[PDB]
Amino acid sequence: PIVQNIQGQMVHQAISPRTLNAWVKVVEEKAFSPEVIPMFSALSEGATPQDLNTMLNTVGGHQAAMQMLKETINEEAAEWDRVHPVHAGPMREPRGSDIAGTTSTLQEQIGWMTNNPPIPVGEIYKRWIILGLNKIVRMYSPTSILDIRQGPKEPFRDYVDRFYKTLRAEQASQEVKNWMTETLLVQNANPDCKTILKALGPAATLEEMMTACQGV
Amino acid sequence: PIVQNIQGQMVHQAISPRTLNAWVKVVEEKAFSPEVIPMFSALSEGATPQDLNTMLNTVGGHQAAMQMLKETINEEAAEWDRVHPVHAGPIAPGQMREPRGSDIAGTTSTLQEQIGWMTNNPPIPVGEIYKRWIILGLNKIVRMYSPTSILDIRQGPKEPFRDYVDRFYKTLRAEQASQEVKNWMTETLLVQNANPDCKTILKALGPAATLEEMMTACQGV
Ligand SMILES: [Fe+3]
Ligand SMILES: [Fe+3]
Ligand SMILES: [Fe+3]
Ligand SMILES: [Fe+3]
Ligand SMILES: [Fe+3]
Ligand SMILES: [Fe+3]
Ligand SMILES: [Fe+3]
Ligand SMILES: [Fe+3]
Ligand SMILES: [Fe+3]
Ligand SMILES: [Fe+3]
Ligand SMILES: [Fe+3]
Ligand SMILES: [Fe+3]
Ligand SMILES: [Fe+3]
Ligand SMILES: [Fe+3]
Ligand SMILES: [Fe+3]
Ligand SMILES: [Fe+3]
Ligand SMILES: [Fe+3]
Ligand SMILES: [Fe+3]
Ligand SMILES: [Fe+3]
Ligand SMILES: [Fe+3]
Ligand SMILES: [Fe+3]
Ligand SMILES: [Fe+3]
Ligand SMILES: [Fe+3]
Ligand code: NA
């Protein structure tokens, strides 16, 4: 975080090791639950980008999640760069990587955050990190198939492929994944295909289903 | 923009008629100057997407410019959506559905939603994001209409002169400049901005060389 000293200067305040301790525990206990996001946002109140990164590599053991977070950060950074075109000539305005803390110093971070007008790089980067965590949660959650729907015009075989791919990426028990495939494949098919599929009979299986809806 | 009740709610306050009148005056007076952009940014501080659209409706009579803003906005909105794909799953009680491009442009979103995004912890700064799109648009407008745009049209060292001529004239046509300025552009800047080898050939032509004669002279240079 940031604190004002008696000179008026805005200076760094380390995130308490007890705040870090609490963050690692939340992750150990609730990893991939949506509850992680609000906790992260509260834990990281007032964070500079460096603070955010301190928090991030404290759970660095989540190699798979970390690569996904980073790919998402890179994407938001590029979008920032897009809508804030650079301008040479001559504090510099931050690029995406400066907001992510990769190409900026702590001093520069404090400088943007407390400038006039201020550029809240801490809040921007926290939002980007939230986008990454949401992606991860969403991909891993059983809830990801409950809401899948075959498009109104979507070819049934395309839908099937998407269905199984989404299911495969979920971290869920086999019993739940089996219940989903047996129930929700036909249940979440579009209006026109559903009708066709139900009329086949309860013993109808995947290949007959795809032939029956082929063309629609 | 956004203000807090004594009862603690973040509510919307319309842009002041004096801020609006100032912005309208800036556009009236500062035609298409680079100066418009910094002013627009100052005047639109804190604006929600609704407020930004309010400012634009006030200067909407500039139809060719509004058309340019529309195309920019549609383009940026389309990229936002590519970067932010729709996610159909349920929204957790402590999450907030992300805005779409059209939500940011204020088209498919409500003031209440805009305020909900803007004041989230941390924000989803839809006012600032939409403001950036508008600014991208304004920069494209000034760059297109300003007589300044042709000045950096320079023939490449290996560019066929006919291609350079096309670029030059296309840029010329799209500018809002007086005829006497455009006459200087065609009669002197075109040669001025030719590459070293073509310029030397062009400058050794007669008093009344026609553009067709120029193209003939510089073919394969
Ligand atoms: Fe914060
Ligand atoms: Fe990457
Ligand atoms: Fe961004
Ligand atoms: Fe701050
Ligand atoms: Fe700024
Ligand atoms: Fe910040
Ligand atoms: Fe988000
Ligand atoms: Fe197939
Ligand atoms: Fe699969
Ligand atoms: Fe069914
Ligand atoms: Fe088909
Ligand atoms: Fe605000
Ligand atoms: Fe106002
Ligand atoms: Fe000036
Ligand atoms: Fe409008
Ligand atoms: Fe969505
Ligand atoms: Fe959130
Ligand atoms: Fe409201
Ligand atoms: Fe965002
Ligand atoms: Fe905003
Ligand atoms: Fe912002
Ligand atoms: Fe310009
Ligand atoms: Fe070339
Ligand atoms: Na980056």
CATH number of B148-221: 1.10.1200.30
Q: Which of A83, A84, A139, A190 to mutate to test the interface with B (most CBs of B within 10 A)?
A: A83
**Interior angle at CA A104, CA A136 and CA A95, nearest 5:** 70
Cβ B39 vs Cβ B135: under 8 Å: no
Largest CA distance in chain B: 81
List C-alpha distances in Å: A59 to A52, A62, A106, A122, B127: 12, 6, 21, 19, 33
Identify the sign of the CA torsion B195, B196, B199, B205.
Answer: negative
CA distance A216 to A192: 8
Nearest Cβ partner for B94 among A37, A138, A148: A37
Per the rule left: phi > 0, alpha: psi between -120 and 50, beta: everything else, B220 is left
- Domains of chain B: which residue ranges? 1-147, 148-221
A-B CB pairs within 8 A amount to 52
Give chain A positions within 8 Å (CB) of B126.
none
**Number of Cβ within a 10 Å radius of residue A73:** 22
CA distance B74 to B167: 26
Return the structure tokens found at B47: 């604006």
Cβ A101 vs Cβ A50: under 8 Å: yes
User: Is the peptide bond prior to A117 cis by the omega test (within 30 degrees of 0)?
Assistant: yes
Which homologous superfamily does the CATH classification assign to the domain defined by A143-216? Retrovirus capsid C-terminal domain (1.10.1200.30)
B88/A149 CB distance under 8 A: yes
For residue A33, the SS3 value is coil
A21 labelled binding-site residue: no
Supply the DSSP string of B16-64, one letter for each residue: PHHHHHHHHHHHHHSTT-TTHHHHHHHHTTT--HHHHHHHHHHTTT-HH
Provide φ and ψ at B20, rounded to 5°: -55, -45
Comparing C-alpha atoms, which of A201, A206, A131 is closest to residue A163?
Answer: A206
CA distance B29 to A201: 74
Cβ B23 vs Cβ B43: under 8 Å: yes
Provide φ and ψ at B2, rounded to 5°: -130, 130
CA distance B201 to B42: 50
Angle between helices A63-83 and B126-145 (to 10 degrees): 40
Nearest Cβ partner for B122 among A84, A127, A143: A127
Return the structure tokens found at A20: 């870090």
B94/A134 CB distance under 8 A: no
CA distance A47 to A53: 10
Q: Which residues contact A174 (CB under 8 A, 6 or more apart)?
A: none
Locate tokens 């609000």: which residue?
A: A38
**Number of Cβ within a 10 Å radius of residue A197:** 19
Strand B2-4 to strand B10-12: parallel, antiparallel, or no bridges (unpaired)? antiparallel
For residue A4, the SS3 value is strand
**Interior angle at CA A132, CA A53 and CA B132, nearest 5:** 90
Give chain A positions within 8 Å (CB) of B129.
83
Cβ A86 vs Cβ A95: under 8 Å: yes
Comparing C-alpha atoms, which of B117, B97, B60, A118 is closest to residue B52?
Answer: B60
Return the structure tokens found at B126: 């839809």
Q: What is the CA radius of gyration of chain A?
A: 24
To one decimal, the resolution in angstroms is 2.0
Cβ B37 vs Cβ B141: under 8 Å: no
Distance B140 CA to ligand 22 centre (A): 8
Nearest Cβ partner for A37 among B76, B87, B95: B95
Cβ A216 vs Cβ A156: under 8 Å: yes
CA distance B106 to B102: 6
Domain A1-142, CATH number (from 1.10.375.10, 3.40.50.10540, 1.10.3720.10, 3.50.50.60): 1.10.375.10
CA distance A47 to A14: 9
List C-alpha distances in Å: B17 to B22, B55, B58: 8, 10, 11
Provide φ and ψ at B76, rounded to 5°: -65, -40
Largest CA distance in chain A: 80
List C-alpha distances in Å: A158 to A92, A139, A205: 48, 19, 17
Q: Technique behind this structure?
A: X-ray
Burial of B214 (0-12, 13-18, 19+ CB in 10 A): buried
Return the structure tokens found at B100: 């779409």
CA distance B176 to B170: 12
CA distance A176 to A142: 8
CA distance A137 to B207: 74
Give chain B positions within 8 Å (CB) of A32.
none
**Interior angle at CA A102, CA A99 and CA A107, nearest 5:** 70
For residue A183, the SS3 value is helix
Fold for B1-147, please state it.
Human Immunodeficiency Virus Type 1 Capsid Protein (1.10.375)
CA dihedral (B207, B213, B216, B221) in degrees, to 10, reads 30
Cβ A180 vs Cβ A145: under 8 Å: yes
Per the rule left: phi > 0, alpha: psi between -120 and 50, beta: everything else, B8 is left
Per the rule left: phi > 0, alpha: psi between -120 and 50, beta: everything else, B106 is left
List C-alpha distances in Å: A7 to A11, A12, A107, A188: 10, 14, 16, 63
The amino acid that residue B18 corresponds to is: R
B122/A130 CB distance under 8 A: yes
Burial of A154 (0-12, 13-18, 19+ CB in 10 A): middle
CA distance A134 to A139: 8
Provide φ and ψ at B176, rounded to 5°: -100, 90
List C-alpha distances in Å: A164 to A110, A160, A210: 47, 6, 14
Comparing C-alpha atoms, which of A55, A53, A64, A47 is closest to residue A23?
Answer: A55
Strand A10-12 to strand B10-12: parallel, antiparallel, or no bridges (unpaired)? unpaired
Cβ B44 vs Cβ B51: under 8 Å: yes
**Interior angle at CA B116, CA B115 and CA B118, nearest 5:** 60
Supply the DSSP string of B71-83, one letter for each residue: HHHHHHHHHHHHH
Provide φ and ψ at A11, rounded to 5°: -125, 160
Distance A119 CA to ligand 15 centre (A): 28
